[PDB]
Amino acid sequence: DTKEQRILRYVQQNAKPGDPQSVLEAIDTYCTQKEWAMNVGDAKGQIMDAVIREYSPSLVLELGAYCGYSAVRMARLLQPGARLLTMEMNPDYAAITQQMLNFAGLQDKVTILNGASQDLIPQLKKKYDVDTLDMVFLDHWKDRYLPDTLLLEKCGLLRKGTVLLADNVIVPGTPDFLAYVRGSSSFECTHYSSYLEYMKVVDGLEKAIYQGP
């Protein structure tokens, strides 16, 4: 089996069905004690929680699902009726993510779309009935944060106040995205210094709030 299958099995056998907090704890224990994996983790996760609670977004887009850790983290704090869409091009990861959300009991709040962001983002309005996004969590290939930000704006998916929250702006790093948002009058940026998941290595989140054109 794969590392991601082992993580899902561990959750199924060590967390409580329908209890998202137990699912996060199981994943964090597994990845601390057994095998590292690229989940956002508890250190950065706590900052994500604080952001979600501040904005109470009704519609969130996530780029890159992996095993569903961040999707569980965000979805568990959404208000009744609020929704998360998460895009994941790897079909095996998309399958893990669906099963993780099912186990957590969050399936009704989240739609896991199996495809590439650059193909799916242009379909959001007409196929998925999206007007604008309240929040976007970027956690996919680091060289695609900037292109996809620019594509979201082109597609009319950003509104005044849309919150972009970007993982891994230090490690592995997203230098073009950071330079761009920090230099642009269309974004108000805040940096939240933290640590790489499960490691004593500095990382950080960037919040970039869209201000319109």
Ligand X SMILES: CNc1ncnc2c1ncn2[C@@H]1O[C@H]([C@@H]2C[C@H]2CNC(=O)c2cc(-c3ccc(F)cc3)cc(O)c2O)C[C@H]1O
Question: Does 206 sit near Mg ion (CB under 5 A)?
Answer: no
Q: Is the dihedral of CA 140, 42, 74, 8 positive or negative?
A: positive
> Which one of the listed residues 4, 28, 42, 139 is annotated catalytic?
139
Question: Does 28 sit near Mg ion (CB under 5 A)?
Answer: no
**Using CB under 6 A as the criterion, which residues of the chain lie in contact with ligand X when the complex forms?**
38, 63-64, 87-90, 93, 116-118, 139-141, 144, 167-168, 171-172, 196-197
Question: Does 70 sit near Mg ion (CB under 5 A)?
Answer: no
Q: Which is nearest to 25 in space by CA: 37, 38, 14?
A: 14
Question: Does 171 sit near Cl ion (CB under 5 A)?
Answer: no
Give the C-alpha distances (Å, rounded to integers) separating 161 from 13, 55, 73, 174. 41, 10, 22, 22
Residue with tokens 């790897």: 90
Q: How far is the CB of 204 from ligand X (least distance, A)?
A: 11
Q: Give helix then strand counts, H and E, for the chain.
A: 9, 7
Q: How far is the CB of 156 from Mg ion (least distance, A)?
A: 27
Residue with tokens 């976007």: 136
Rounded (10°) CA dihedral 66, 72, 73, 76: 160
42 in active site = no
> Which one of the listed residues 114, 168, 206, 207 is annotated catalytic?
168
Binding residues for substrate, by number, are 142, 168, 197
Which residues have a catalytic role annotated? Answer: 139, 142, 167-168, 197
Residues in the site for Cl ion, rule: CB under 5 A? 39-43, 66, 69-70, 197-198
